[PDB]
Design a protein around this ligand. Structure first.
Ligand SMILES: CO[C@@H]1[C@H](O)[C@@H](O)O[C@H](CO)[C@H]1O
Ligand SMILES: CO[C@@H]1[C@H](O)[C@@H](O)O[C@H](CO)[C@H]1O
Lengths: 144, 144
């Protein structure tokens, strides 16, 4: 798998208030990845994958799907992902990867399964049931 | 269960373009409920619950959790919910309810299991994996 022509040196989870692995549902999650390219690299893809305790994919995406071109010159980089964490309360794992190609069939630079364990606790927005939260609006009107 | 002091007479699903039961992932879903109150009712709560093809709770919420007060005089009403359908492609069901109290322990007016079948097909935005879609931002930068 990993050939380490690029390496993920460290992964940090952050809220808008500071570094933490504990988030209320709906809070903004920043994923910071310290990356070092040992050589020049073209067509680099970075991917994240959030899974639950039973290995089920909760949400995964990479920069090929987001349409984001990444080119690395030999040296150091900070990669950042940002997303509202609209998930049910629970315990989750984060997997990260640097590869080539949409489904890493072309080349594998560095894959780290379950690099971070984090958890969602409580609700930042409305309380809700189910695996995820959809921002919802409501109105009603009397009709003659 | 239901005592039918208020009755959901019909439930319809909507996009911003018209009535439909087929949505690309990320499209805005409107849920219309035709409601009949046969008598005056106070402290009414309206709830929706999206489940997947295996009976799993995907997302549910009600107007008590949204802190949206509802009072019904004898007559006819149109209830509308609106939400981004940030879900994986697949087949889903909608369950609806009118009751009293946050968790319907107080009174049950009308509960309809799987009132509508709908499905998410394709991606209005980025393609993704997992049960749900979290709107994500990416950036990278060299660091000394
Ligand atoms: C670890 O991230 C993975 C990885 O980039 C790749 O397998 O594609 C997935 C999205 O399809 C993404 O979640
Ligand atoms: C059918 O909707 C339900 C119902 O209002 C109640 O059981 O509370 C749930 C949210 O907690 C909501 O999904």
């Amino acid at each position: 798998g990993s050939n380490f022509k690029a390496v993920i040196k460290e992964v940090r989870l952050k809220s808008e208030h500071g570094y933490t692995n504990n988030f209320p549902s709906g809070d903004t999650l920043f994923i910071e990845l310290d990356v070092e390219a040992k050589e020049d690299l073209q067509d680099v893809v970075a991917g994240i994958l959030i899974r639950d305790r039973f290995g089920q994919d909760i949400f995964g995406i990479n920069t090929y799907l987001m349409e984001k071109k990444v080119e690395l010159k030999k040296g150091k980089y900070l990669f950042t992902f940002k997303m509202p964490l609209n998930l049910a309360p629970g315990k989750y794992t984060l997997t990260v990867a640097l590869h080539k190609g949409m489904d890493h069939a072309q080349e594998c630079y560095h894959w780290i399964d379950n690099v971070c364990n984090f958890e969602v606790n409580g609700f930042k927005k409305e309380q809700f049931v189910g695996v995820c939260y959809l921002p919802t609006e409501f109105n009603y009107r009397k009709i003659p």
